C-alpha cells in the first residue's frame, strides 16, 4: 500500500490578520517526510517548508510547519492578502511522488 | 536560476507531443529532475523523474506511454508523450527535485490541451 | 439548513460486504464535509473529476454514499480505470467518475482473534461488472462445460469467499471501511449544496 | 481434465516465442488461468494470469515483454514472449487458479532453452 | 510491501515411517492464505493443502497443514517412499503470486 | 569443524549505514545455514543464482557478508536488476548475483521516539555505483556549474541525509537490518562447505 495524503479543510474563508492552521494527514506514519507548497492564482507552486518544519530560504516567518507521523499542520500566524492561495502537501523521499489534493484559503 | 518549458499545444486524442524544459543556473544531468502536471481546476500530479545517474521512474497512469530524457549539451529536460488522452490535459511543470529538501525550482508551465 | 446525514453512513457498527455493497441516497440537505474531515476516525479522502477545494461551492442533484469493507491492498481498486478482483467482480467505478473515495483502517472494529468471517467478496464471475453494477447472486459457478445444477464440486464453486480478518494481519490484509460519494449532476434542480 | 502446453524450444537472446496451452475438462475463458515457470534447479515463479473477465496481470520481471491471451473457440491459453533473456530459460507450466483454493490443475510444462554461446 | 515467504528446513533427510514437519514463514500476517505443493523433479507441482489446513481432494490423510498469521507448518504423519520431493508454499488470494523457495525432502 | 562466524555479522549490536556498508569475509569454516534460520529470528531470506535447497550440498572459495540498515520499502532494491536511490547510489548487486539476501524488521532496536537519525543514505551522486562498489565520501555535491569549494549553499548540498526512524512509522518506513551473503567461486580451493 502506498501512502495517501489528505488535506483539510478543503476550503477555508478567513480575514486578513487571522491566524489559520491547515492540516495534512498521512495514511501511515511518514516520520517528518512532508513538504508544503503555496500556489497563487496563475502561478507555479512555491516551496514553503520541507522536512515537516524547516522553512525554505526566503520564506516569511509567519509560516510554520509542525507534526510527525500521520498528522501535519501548516500555520500562518497572521494572514496577508497574498497568502490567499491553494496549499499542497507532498510526501518526501519517495519517487511515486504523492501530493495532497489541496486546501484553498479564500477571503471572508 | 530558471526552468523554461515549451512544446505545449492543442492535440487530438491518440496523438503525440514532446515537451522540453530549458534550464539555466543548475545542471539538469546533475539533478533529480521531475515533471509534475496540473489538470484545470485540479491539484498537482507527479509524472516522472530522471535521476542524475540516469534511472527513470513514471507515474502508473503514464507508464509505457511517456518517456523522460535529457540533453546534457543543451542543459535541457524532455518529456515524450505518446497516445495522449483527456486525462493528460494539464499544465506541465518542470521542476528540480532535492528529494528530502522538496522541489525548490519550478518552471512556469506549458499547457497541453486535448480536444474532445 | 439541515446537514446531510453523513454520520449515519460513517459511524455504522457493521459495514456491508463489498459484493453486497450498501447504497444510501443523500439529498435535500446541506453538505458540510467538515463534519466528515473532523471525524477523527477520518483517515483518507481522494476525489476524482472534481477538486475537494471546490466542493463547498458546488451543488449536485443527488449524492450517493456506497459503503463496504475490503482489505487494505484492495483500496487502490476503488478508483477509475482499475482492474482486479474487486473492481472487476465486486464494485466498479466508471472511467469518468465524479466523486470522492473515503477509507480508513478498521482493524480495531472488523478483525477478531481467530478471524472475522462476516465480510465477503465475490471470487468467481464470468464477466466484469458495469460501473455501479451490483451482483448479489450466489449461483454455483460453472468453471467447465458441465452444468452444476446447484451442486458444489469439481468445476462447480460457490462464488463468494470470506476475508477472515485477524488482528495480526499485515496492513495490506487488514480491513478497511470505504465510503464512495458519487456526485450526480443530472438536468434537474440541485438538492445538495455545501455552504 | 488436461492442460497441454506446447511451443517451447531453443531460442537466441532477443528472439520471441509463443507458448500455447490446450485445455480439456475446464473452460479457459471461465477461469483464472496462470503461467508459472521454473528455471533449471530453482523454485516456482509465477509469470502471468488472465481473469475470466479478461483482466491480465504480470510479474514485474516480464512486464512489457510477455502478453497472455486466450482463444475461446479453441479453449486455449497463450503466452507471447518477446526479447527473451537468459533468465527466461525455464519450464513453463500452464495452471488453472482457484485463487483461494490454490492451483489445482497443471500441465506438465514446455521447456524454453535460451542458448548461452 | 510485498509479502515474502521463507521455507525451512532447506533440505531434510528422513526415513520411511518418520514424522516430519516443515515450516513456511511469512514476512507479515497473511491470515490463513497459504497453500502447500509437492513437486517431483521435472513434474508439475501437486496441490496438497489450501487455506493453510484444508486437504486437497484425494490427498492422503497423512498430510496436514497448520498455522495462521506468519508461521505455517506442513506435517507428514508417517513418511512413505513416494513422499520424498521438494515442497513449496504459496501465498493465496493475491496475483503477484509469491512462492517459497522450497524444502527438499530426501531419504536418509 | 569450526563453524563460520555468522553470529558476528547477524547478531551484532549496531549496523552500518547503507552508504558505508560493512563487509566481512568468511572462509575456512563450516557454513551451517541451519543455525542461521533457527536462531536470531531472521524473518526474510531470499537467494539468487542458487537454490536454498542446494546450499548444504555446495562449497565456495569465499563467502562475503555485507550488512547495513535501510527502509522497509527499500529492501526490494537489494536484488539483481533494480534501480533507485539505494541500488544506484548506496549498494548495488550485480545482474548475475549468486547469494542470498536476509532481512528483518529492526523497529524495536533502530527507531527512537522523536526519531533516530544515526542511519544515513547517500542522496546525491552524479553516476551509479558499479556492483559491490562502496562510496563513503562526504564531499559537498555540485548541482550546478559553480564549484562548491566545500561550502554548503544553493546547488551545493551535503550528499548524505538521515533516515527518519520513529516507532510510529508505517512498516515500509521502519528500519530493516539487511545481510547480503555473496557466494564466490574462484579458480582456487573451496574453503566454505557446511555439511
Numbering used by the authors:
A (entry chain B), E (entry chain D): 0 to 107
B (entry chain A): 2 to 117
C (entry chain F), F (entry chain E): 333 to 527
D (entry chain C): 2 to 118
Question: Can I see the authors' text?
Answer:
The S protein on the virus surface binds to the Angiotensin Converting Enzyme II (ACE2) on the host cells to enter the cell. RBD region is about 240 amino acids long, which mainly binds to the host cell receptor, and S2 is in charge of fusing envelope and cell membrane. Most neutralizing antibodies target the RBD region of SARS-CoV-2 spike (S) trimer, which consists of three copies of S1 and three copies of S2. In this study, we recovered three potent neutralizing antibodies by RBD-specific single B cell sorting strategy from two COVID-19 convalescents.
Then, we resolved two antigen-antibody complex structures. The two complexes were solved at resolutions of 2.07 Å and 3.0 Å, respectively. Next, we evaluated the neutralizing activity of these three antibodies against Omicron variants, BA.5, BF.7 and XBB, respectively. The results were shown in Figure S7 ; none of the antibodies could neutralize any one of the three variants. So, we presume that Omicron would escape both the antibodies. It implies that VH experiences a greater selective pressure than Vκ during affinity maturation, which is consistent with the notion that VH play a more important role in the RBD binding than Vκ, as suggested by the structures of RBD-antibody complexes.
